């Protein structure tokens, strides 16, 4: 089946991914395209297999966080457009042009220098650019009518750059008060009809995320950027309760019990600090997962795992590579039983939203901090591979 | 200097690992050897280059968490003995013997079947084994003197195995109260005099971690296991106060500013949730690090970084790949300045132990969860190389 030295692993279900994409294609306008976002190692799911699969079932472009995340995808064989969403240093202009990665930019002075660099180095390829406008997120991008017009001018004079898009980003589209999201929208559509009254023609316009596409599908324009909804999770509990789109979660996490024993011999202290003392006939089972894997130390004396269809609790402090759980008085368990940490087993479930509520964070962070020393296995059409 | 597309990195100082080993060699009995623990990517510092340095300046053997972590070491040329501290499935018994890796064991059936596997293949390699004795931590190991003699007898009746050590683990050796450390020792020692009064010769014996080698060096026996002290960090505030040994921290985390602007136009909101609203002459700067890199979301509106030798605060919510900081009304700075996240700058310092207190955990978790998409650079004799 699954043969490992240290027995812990992840399963990603690609039949779920393809379903999530169908649901979204069917909600937004027929005219708009889809940009699959696979940065941070596919939100901790694996970037190569998910993008391969998303391009064959509805998406047409991809988005990452850095030039290095994009080069990984070109090396796997992918030929689609790749856009970089953060800031790229001028010292990577020649390399971005060589691998044909699309860059974000928003300053007059960055534009001219990236043009002279490619002018001296012979030429070869032209570097493609998307312009970022800041309408209220306050992170990256240009902020006035007058400033934007200067950038479009410096870009149109540049013979080695090529203009293929313009976008914005909503900071509160997952919240039930829609005031600030409509603010950003008017600011944006106004900036670009100013451009029009100058006789300037526009490329691809994108602005929606998962929450915007579900909640305001009339903002879809040319393209949307689908991220968290690709992996089967909702942006907020608010957006889930709307009940407009049904998604299925793709990831789960599993291990195998490594040792079982009865605590009838003194002393009966468990794990560091001796914060837990067992009873003479309690059964303690040891498991191969720790906080260096991403299972938070905050969960000691507090969390659950699923064994044989039931929740059993964590006993003592979490350690770097191992946790102990209590099977109770006279137990019932054997070396090699399968244990579910996130996901489903028989009747029961422990979901990623539940763990994130317990730790006062969001599902976004619970998945994308799963270590890479854990091996990932993919399910497609019922069968397993890697 | 450094040249990166996304501008964030780690520096590890090997001159400082060297001084740490010296300091520990001085304080323990000159008869005992040192085994260096590099499991979990070398507590987040990188396993390869730290192991090489250690083996060159005082260590004799290594410890890791699993057979996979040991194969990355042999692939870079390291020929020293390597012990696996966790449980290894019978699946990998033949693999362990080919790469010459040492495994822990404490069961009679596991020895029988491990010996069988290598018999049925002839096999010219004998697999080395260390026996784990549980005297008080109840994680793994054997518990009574009766059943440790069956395991000793079985291992001996095994022509394809080889005994090369016997060990235990102190569960509270970094606390003011010494009651339990005294007792585990008493038990472990009487299990050994029990054995010796049987005709049996004993191999290498070890029981000490960083904490117990500082406070109880009369426990050093044949060998110690140096883990956290190697990277320059104290197991507890109580062990540090005893002021018996001097340590120097080995790791820093830095980045470069990607954009800067004055918040003149409206709206002046910053980041997701609009939880921070700027002033019209306030300066706001953007950094390339986030919670998928390992910088906890819990530091939203609460953490600091060092710019030009001063503490600036995080502004608004932490996001997946970027943070935002405030420089004040008319603050000075430009695109490209250097900032320190963990470490020292001009006169100031933000220490790993301070960040750990903010989040109610320990320095072990902070360092060993820094992601692998962040590059590490090494400093030896005051200069650079990756
Ligand atoms: C600019 C941008 N667009 C789209 C996304 C995807 O966001 P979400 O996962 O909420 O759909 C992110 C993250 C982002 O930073
Ligand atoms: C059994 C064992 N020994 C030694 C170490 C190294 O511990 P420390 O850094 O506290 O010295 C660890 C961790 C461990 O689990
Ligand atoms: Cl942005
Ligand atoms: Cl142990």
Swiss-Prot record, chains A, B:
<dbReference type="InterPro" id="IPR000821">
    <property type="entry name" value="Ala_racemase"/>
</dbReference>
<dbReference type="InterPro" id="IPR029066">
    <property type="entry name" value="PLP-binding_barrel"/>
</dbReference>
<dbReference type="GO" id="GO:0030632">
    <property type="term" value="P:D-alanine biosynthetic process"/>
</dbReference>
<keyword id="KW-0663">Pyridoxal phosphate</keyword>
<feature type="active site" description="Proton acceptor; specific for L-alanine">
    <location>
        <position position="272"/>
    </location>
</feature>
<keyword id="KW-0413">Isomerase</keyword>
<feature type="binding site">
    <location>
        <position position="139"/>
    </location>
    <ligand>
        <name>substrate</name>
    </ligand>
</feature>
<dbReference type="InterPro" id="IPR020622">
    <property type="entry name" value="Ala_racemase_pyridoxalP-BS"/>
</dbReference>
<dbReference type="GO" id="GO:0008784">
    <property type="term" value="F:alanine racemase activity"/>
</dbReference>
<comment type="similarity">
    <text>Belongs to the alanine racemase family.</text>
</comment>
<dbReference type="GO" id="GO:0009252">
    <property type="term" value="P:peptidoglycan biosynthetic process"/>
</dbReference>
<comment type="pathway">
    <text>Amino-acid biosynthesis; D-alanine biosynthesis; D-alanine from L-alanine: step 1/1.</text>
</comment>
<feature type="active site" description="Proton acceptor; specific for D-alanine">
    <location>
        <position position="39"/>
    </location>
</feature>
<dbReference type="InterPro" id="IPR001608">
    <property type="entry name" value="Ala_racemase_N"/>
</dbReference>
<dbReference type="Pfam" id="PF01168">
    <property type="entry name" value="Ala_racemase_N"/>
</dbReference>
<dbReference type="Pfam" id="PF00842">
    <property type="entry name" value="Ala_racemase_C"/>
</dbReference>
<dbReference type="GO" id="GO:0030170">
    <property type="term" value="F:pyridoxal phosphate binding"/>
</dbReference>
<feature type="modified residue" description="N6-(pyridoxal phosphate)lysine">
    <location>
        <position position="39"/>
    </location>
</feature>
<dbReference type="InterPro" id="IPR009006">
    <property type="entry name" value="Ala_racemase/Decarboxylase_C"/>
</dbReference>
<dbReference type="GO" id="GO:0005829">
    <property type="term" value="C:cytosol"/>
</dbReference>
<dbReference type="InterPro" id="IPR011079">
    <property type="entry name" value="Ala_racemase_C"/>
</dbReference>
<comment type="function">
    <text>Catalyzes the interconversion of L-alanine and D-alanine. May also act on other amino acids.</text>
</comment>
<protein>
    <recommendedName>
        <fullName>Alanine racemase 2</fullName>
        <ecNumber>5.1.1.1</ecNumber>
    </recommendedName>
</protein>
<feature type="binding site">
    <location>
        <position position="320"/>
    </location>
    <ligand>
        <name>substrate</name>
    </ligand>
</feature>
